[PDB]
């Protein structure tokens, strides 16, 4: 086509979606990880995770307001990944890298799994 | 912070949100423009437009499944802008620039209004 493109548009969209999350505006699901609860937008979860994409395209699960993750999933690892989904920023540290990689493999977030594997290989 | 960042994340998120729109997955509103109907995600509309942000933060309008725009709004201008919201790409042409600028001013999409003003000034 003969379209023009606004370079910062996608980043500005994601920044506003994170502002809505922080104010709990139009969140339509709660993700339960052990005792911890995380509110989010189904569409953003699907856009970032192969696991959520599969869950919310299912004709029955698409209507659930609560999703319980496998009890092996660490709430801190999930929190770091949910923050990444809404910001593009990953808080990867020596003390959390194993829990982050395991959570990203479960959530099917291929690019996060790739950077965790590379950072572990270096050490 | 000490975060790392994935450069293509925001663009990849927006690409997936557009894939959901094209398949009509989790769309929660219909925007009526004269005889024409456009299905979309309320959160994406809010993230891109000052007008939709105001509408869907309103305690009564946040629950509407149908929104009717002012009859002066041109369906083609709206279609071009909805495409921009989901892609960052604007199909700006000599034959549509006046309808696109008027629709962007109504929708309160400041960056689109700015490029339309510049393209009109040049001609």
């Amino acid at each position: 086509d003969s379209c023009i493109q606004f370079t910062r548009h996608a980043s500005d969209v994601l920044l506003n979606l994170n502002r809505l999350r922080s104010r709990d505006i139009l969140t339509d699901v709660v993700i339960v990880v052990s005792r911890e609860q995380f509110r989010a937008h189904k569409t953003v979860l699907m856009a970032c995770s192969g696991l959520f994409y599969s869950i919310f395209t299912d004709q029955l699960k698409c209507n659930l307001s609560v999703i319980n993750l496998d009890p092996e999933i660490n709430p801190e690892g999930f929190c770091i990944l949910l923050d990444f989904m809404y910001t593009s920023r990953l808080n990867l540290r020596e003390g959390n890298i194993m829990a982050v990689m395991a959570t990203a493999m479960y959530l099917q977030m291929e690019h996060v799994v790739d950077t965790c594997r590379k950072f572990i290989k270096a050490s | 912070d000490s975060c790392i960042q994935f450069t293509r994340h925001a663009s990849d998120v927006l690409l997936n949100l557009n894939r959901l729109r094209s398949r009509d997955i989790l769309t929660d509103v219909v925007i009526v423009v004269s005889r024409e109907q456009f299905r979309a995600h309320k959160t994406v509309l809010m993230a891109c437009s000052g007008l939709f942000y105001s509408i869907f933060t309103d305690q009564l309008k946040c629950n509407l499944s149908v929104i009717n725009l002012d009859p002066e709004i041109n369906p083609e201008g709206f279609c071009i802008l909805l495409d921009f919201m989901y892609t960052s790409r604007l199909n700006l042409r000599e034959g549509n620039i006046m309808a696109v600028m008027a629709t962007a001013m109504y929708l309160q999409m400041e960056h689109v209004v700015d490029t339309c003003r510049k393209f009109i000034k040049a001609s």
Binding site: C3, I4, Q5, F6, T7 | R89, L90, T115
Partner: peptide, 4 residues
């Protein structure tokens, strides 16, 4: 704005 750019030519993509």
């Amino acid at each position: 704005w750019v030519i993509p």
